[PDB]
Amino acid sequence: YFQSAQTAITDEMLANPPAGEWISYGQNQENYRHSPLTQITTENVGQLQLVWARGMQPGKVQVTPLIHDGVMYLANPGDVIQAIDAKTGDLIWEHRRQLPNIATLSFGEPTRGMALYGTNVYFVSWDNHLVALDMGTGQVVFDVDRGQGDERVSNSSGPIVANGTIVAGSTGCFVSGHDSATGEELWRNYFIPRARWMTGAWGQITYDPVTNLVHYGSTAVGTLYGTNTRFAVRPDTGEIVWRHQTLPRDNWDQECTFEMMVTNVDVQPSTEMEGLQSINPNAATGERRVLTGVPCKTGTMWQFDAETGEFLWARDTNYQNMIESIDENGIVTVNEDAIEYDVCPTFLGGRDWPSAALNPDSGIYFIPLNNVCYDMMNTSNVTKLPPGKDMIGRIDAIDISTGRTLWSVERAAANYSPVLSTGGGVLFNGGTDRYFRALSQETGETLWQTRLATVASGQAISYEVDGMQYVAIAGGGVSYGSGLNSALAGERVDSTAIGNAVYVFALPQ
């Protein structure tokens, strides 16, 4: 079950990957989650067929497939790694790591996110080993332990490549650089000085090749320094260039550790920005390289200068009440009331790990959200809907230049699935209701849907083989966000958890 090859992936390649491939977690290193491919447009997306599906191992499916040179690399729950013909669905090889039993939590935990570099596939194992497999055969190139004990420190977002260095987080409590050839540790940074869900940068890590900076976030666990903090570090040495705390007094497990994206924007924040918390009145206006996105579950969209971390603006998305205000320098003041009384949002967020996408060409950011609040208390659960809100699942389209909401669309069932932007002005998203849906980037209108065997829980991607654009997504398991459907009073949501699979769609052509 082997291939040889080529086309060995350099740092230059990761910095300018082929339009038709998906070789970083967000396809480009600055993230975005945007396929520049254009065959599938709004006019024809309603014709999309299933080309092929393949069954995956049971467990939570949160995976972003990678495609290189016509090969799909697919991490299954339980550290089963597969390489599949990305046009036909024929298995090439499969590598099963021997585990087993009880570490950090119908089978496994997500190994969602892998990296390609040189001729290796890299992932962090359920027991915290950095592991490199050969692309051609699935054979182990190296297996190195990052922990000591053993322990119960894990990792779910996975490693990324940053200028030859392999960088990875945790779920002790640090981010670490590693040698791409040996896997030996080059540096580690902890988050918190020396004197409640997941803890310690298990979110997505973003490398910008232009400024040569790696960006990661910490979680909670004075302001409680440096909890829930965004860090911009150099990749070879881990040195810290700039930081900023996005949520100080966190009593709600809001985990400011999700993907932030680096891009060029005309910085032109509007005072009519919805959910506006604060615009720095001393910041320049005009073209600028920027770090922007929603880092925390609480839903605040921020923009910083990428390089200096100069604060630009901050703004609400989902209704929330943990944050009383943010000043002119982006210092957050938490609502001490919550730390009468309806806490919004939840510990499953307005947002959570399911990633936002950015269309770089129009500068629209698309974030999958959930309208949900806590509660003092079909059958019963801890959550409830925010005031005057009908539906739970939501996607918000926001202009990263002005901060103005372009549109905002909802459906009853919880979302809790990533979105994928494409060059054809169409946006894909799954969801807790098993639906895989195509929306218009222009309007938010649904142009196409299918329905998967399970919750449409994983990251949609897009790639090309022989001129055909493909769109793929997995795949299933039990989703924390399907439990959000308890707040729905008018309908049960059929969140089937068994039947895991990856699915690949295409124009009939």
Asked if 72 and 456 touch (Cβ cutoff 8 Å), the reply is no
Block residue for tokens 């396929």:
35
Task: Give just the sign of the alpha carbon dihedral 221, 348, 356, 336.
Answer: negative
Distance CA 207, CA 260 (A): 10
Q: 329 or 378: whose CB is closer to its own copies? A: 378
Site for its own copies contains 340 (CB under 8 A): no
Residue ranges in 418-457 that form contacts with its own copies under rule CB under 8 A: 434, 450-454
The count of residues interacting with its own copies (CB under 8 A) is: 72
Q: 178 or 234: whose CB is closer to its own copies? A: 178
Site for its own copies contains 96 (CB under 8 A): no
Site for its own copies contains 10 (CB under 8 A): no
Q: 50 or 240: whose CB is closer to its own copies? A: 50
Q: Smallest gap, in angstroms, from Cβ of residue 130 to its own copies?
A: 9
Site for its own copies contains 66 (CB under 8 A): no
Q: Which residues pair with 362 in a beta bridge?
A: none
One-letter amino acid at 114 equals: M
Of 468, 357, 476, the closest CA to residue 44 belongs to 468
**333 — phi, psi (to 5°)?**
-110, 115
Distance CA 231, CA 236 (A): 15
**45 — phi, psi (to 5°)?**
-65, -30
Site for its own copies contains 65 (CB under 8 A): no
Task: Give whole-number Cα distances, 346 to 305, 369, 482, in Å.
Answer: 29, 11, 14
Site for its own copies contains 392 (CB under 8 A): no
Q: 369 or 420: whose CB is closer to its own copies? A: 420
Site for its own copies contains 100 (CB under 8 A): yes
Q: 397 or 472: whose CB is closer to its own copies? A: 472
Residue ranges in 287-316 that form contacts with its own copies under rule CB under 8 A: none
Contact with its own copies (CB under 8 A) among 13, 144, 173, 192: 144
Q: 210 or 412: whose CB is closer to its own copies? A: 412
Asked if 394 and 318 touch (Cβ cutoff 8 Å), the reply is yes
Task: Give just the sign of the alpha carbon dihedral 377, 382, 386, 389.
Answer: negative
Q: Smallest gap, in angstroms, from Cβ of residue 38 to its own copies?
A: 20
Site for its own copies contains 99 (CB under 8 A): yes
Q: 106 or 285: whose CB is closer to its own copies? A: 106
Contact with its own copies (CB under 8 A) among 8, 50, 284, 339: 50
Contact with its own copies (CB under 8 A) among 85, 236, 375, 399: 85
Asked if 389 and 319 touch (Cβ cutoff 8 Å), the reply is yes
Q: 404 or 483: whose CB is closer to its own copies? A: 483
Binding map of its own copies across residues 167-206, x = CB under 8 A, - = no contact: ----------------xx----------------------
The 3-state DSSP class for residue 15 equals helix
Contact with its own copies (CB under 8 A) among 379, 387, 388, 467: 379
Q: Smallest gap, in angstroms, from Cβ of residue 34 to its own copies?
A: 23
Block residue for tokens 């809790």:
416
**12 — phi, psi (to 5°)?**
-55, -40
Of 304, 300, 303, the closest CA to residue 322 belongs to 300
Block residue for tokens 């697919």:
74
Q: 308 or 378: whose CB is closer to its own copies? A: 378
Of 412, 440, 416, the closest CA to residue 428 belongs to 440
Site for its own copies contains 98 (CB under 8 A): yes
- Binding piece for its own copies, criterion CB under 8 A, among 116-124, 145-153, 159-167, 205-213: 145-153
Site for its own copies contains 351 (CB under 8 A): no
Distance CA 460, CA 22 (A): 11
Q: Smallest gap, in angstroms, from Cβ of residue 298 to its own copies?
A: 24
Q: Smallest gap, in angstroms, from Cβ of residue 358 to its own copies?
A: 28
Contact with its own copies (CB under 8 A) among 37, 348, 465, 484: 465
Residue ranges in 116-135 that form contacts with its own copies under rule CB under 8 A: 127, 129
Contact with its own copies (CB under 8 A) among 17, 20, 26, 58: 58
Residue ranges in 474-493 that form contacts with its own copies under rule CB under 8 A: 476, 490-492
Using CB atoms within 10 Å of the CB of residue 308, give its burial: 0 to 12 exposed, 13 to 18 middle, 19+ buried.
Answer: exposed
Q: Which residues pair with 74 in a beta bridge?
A: 82
Residue ranges in 19-48 that form contacts with its own copies under rule CB under 8 A: 46-48
Distance CA 7, CA 421 (A): 26
How is residue 69 written in tokens?
């040179």
Task: Give whole-number Cα distances, 323 to 108, 237, 313, in Å.
Answer: 36, 35, 15
